[PDB]
A paper describes a structure:
The phosphate acyltransferase PlsX is one of the few proteins known to localize to RIFs in B. subtilis, which are present in a punctate pattern and stained with a high specificity with the lipid analog indocarbocyanine dye DiIC12. PlsX is an obvious peripheral membrane protein because it was over-expressed and purified as a cytosol protein10 and yet was consistently observed to associate with the membrane.
B. subtilis PlsX was crystallized in the presence of the product analog palmitoyl phosphoramide and the crystal structure was determined at 2.30 Å resolution. The only obvious difference with the previous structure lies in a 13-residue fragment (residues 250–262) at the exposed end of the helix bundle stem. The 13-residue fragment is structurally different in the two subunits of the dimeric structure. It is comprised of a 9-residue (residues 253–261) α-helix and a 2-residue loop in chain B and a largely random coil loop in chain A. Interestingly, the 9-residue α-helical peptide in chain B is amphipathic with Thr253, Thr255, and Lys257 at the interface and Leu254, Leu258, and Ala261 forming the nonpolar surface together with the hydrophobic part of the interfacial residues. The N-terminus of the α-peptide is connected to the end of one vertical helix through the 2-residue loop (Thr251 and Ser252) and its C-terminus is connected to another vertical helix of the four-helix bundle stem via a one-residue sharp turn (Val262). This amphipathic α-peptide was formed in the crystal likely due to the presence of the product analog, palmitoyl phosphoramide, which is an anionic detergent by nature. By mutating the interfacial residues of the amphipathic peptide and determining their effects on the subcellular localization, we showed that this α-peptide is indeed responsible for the RIFs localization through direct interaction with the membrane.
Author numbering:
A (entry chain A): 1 to 326
B (entry chain B): 1 to 325
Write the structure that this text describes.
Amino acid sequence: MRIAVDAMGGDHAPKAVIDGVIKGIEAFDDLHITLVGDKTTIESHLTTTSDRITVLHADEVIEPTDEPVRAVRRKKNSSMVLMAQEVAENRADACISAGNTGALMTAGLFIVGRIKGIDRPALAPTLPTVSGDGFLLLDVGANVDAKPEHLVQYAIMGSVYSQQVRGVTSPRVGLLNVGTEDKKGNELTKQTFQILKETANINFIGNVEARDLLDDVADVVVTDGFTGNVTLKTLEGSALSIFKMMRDVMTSTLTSKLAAAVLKPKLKEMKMKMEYSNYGGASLFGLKAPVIKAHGSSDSNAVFHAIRQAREMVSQNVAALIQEEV
Amino acid sequence: MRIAVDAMGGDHAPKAVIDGVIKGIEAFDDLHITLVGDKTTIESHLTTTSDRITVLHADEVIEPTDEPVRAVRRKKNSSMVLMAQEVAENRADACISAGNTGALMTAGLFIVGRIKGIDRPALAPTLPTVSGDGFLLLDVGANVDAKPEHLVQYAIMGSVYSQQVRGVTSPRVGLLNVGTEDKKGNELTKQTFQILKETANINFIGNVEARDLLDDVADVVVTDGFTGNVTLKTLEGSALSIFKMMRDVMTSTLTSKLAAAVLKPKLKEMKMKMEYSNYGGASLFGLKAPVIKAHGSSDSNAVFHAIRQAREMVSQNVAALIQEE
């Protein structure tokens, strides 16, 4: 098993990405990593662990302010393009980048290519729940204009991932909607509900309301890329607001000074919702191989969990199973 | 000022509705309330004797499972329909119900009627922000399938409300979107962006991302009913979920004890988070009179704030001002 990793994308790149790669190499014996980026810089951090790591030099990098299609086509020697090329030329089974989301989706689509029978890829992060089981939200902005058939394919891919990678035997697939009632939604959502109702290979549990997303309402929640993107950003801003209010309550002068016992829980609280990177990162479903967008602020542990998820996606043959299921 | 209130709709109706009405009557000297529902049941809960509370008997009620059009047409003597008829016959200036949302919107459309020039009314609640300035979100589910023209009308109505009732001189109008760039959004949203940019009567500041809604990115935030409903419900349910997740962190005897010291400020925090507290209910902009949908789980405090918001809406002539635009 070979995974190509973009060493240059991300806020803490390249150090955090390299440190996560070293953690994955130490954890999984069968794993081979191709680290793509500035070779000499990458080698500077690799002085203690270099066993199953190959370093592939990339002269250029894609910056966050550049337009994705132009950057991917023009900068053939960027770390992201060379990383995707490793997968396309069959020198890697999966790839991971913490870089620009749009650039990675462009490179995945243009270079890695779609699974046969898959119309449009979907961006799918695993989000937290109160129980800690988590759930898959797909499509959070890979495809803004969606057809009902696209959403049906999203449900199938999310079900295969939830079964093979998360080990959920019969994943509950819900359709994000304005109500729990069967006939709710706009045209796209109602047409999708009717097709989902007739889709044999999934455990379709119906419409799910947004208010219940974090309450373990479903294992897979399906939506179009625009609504999903808006939903994910709403979740992020809500998490920041509540953390801010809690920090004010736990650090206020009006409260007991002894309740300073509580200062240390602030970090734990920030961890519980803000960082869902422990779940692995946003997968681009529908491509010929696993392509994973690691969060831009990924530290070494986040990179490690993205590696662990990509490894399971490869070993459990998710792409081939998706091809068969459609 | 007279407001007709549906005493029968809502999870904690009729006790919470009657108690909220009594709180409004005690807070506002000028307020007259017509309580619509079963006279004997209402009189059981009436702890007050006040000439400014009148009881209007309604033989039937529209249940949460009833179909909106069919129930509204069939149940002519329901509390919701009689409440709306009070507004239509000019025996009340506004009405409030915590009952079935689809039924209430249908009654508003059928009985109260739309302002001339408005194709579709919108469901518009006021949400809190970090600064305390607040912002108006619309449409949050009156019409799930919207055209660009409908969103333009939502921007005009929201701006009028923000200026006249909320005292914002030049309301900043943002289009809820996935990016700041002009070409962002799905087909409906980018088309709306171009029309909104060419719209004369508004201060359009462009696209706004959902992550900044609570940080005063805009005074008025415009979306279609499907996306707006999903956004609003995400905010409410997620605030409850995340608060529960963070509170779970403090469970150990020393941390339980430390948490109980902060218990009074966090009950205060939960109250401050409830968005039926910060404003009343979602107002239906575009009808001839104010019709307010209070949250189905409204307690007395939520009912009261719905009354206070309806009172501000009547006093500032928003229906007339929206019509002028």
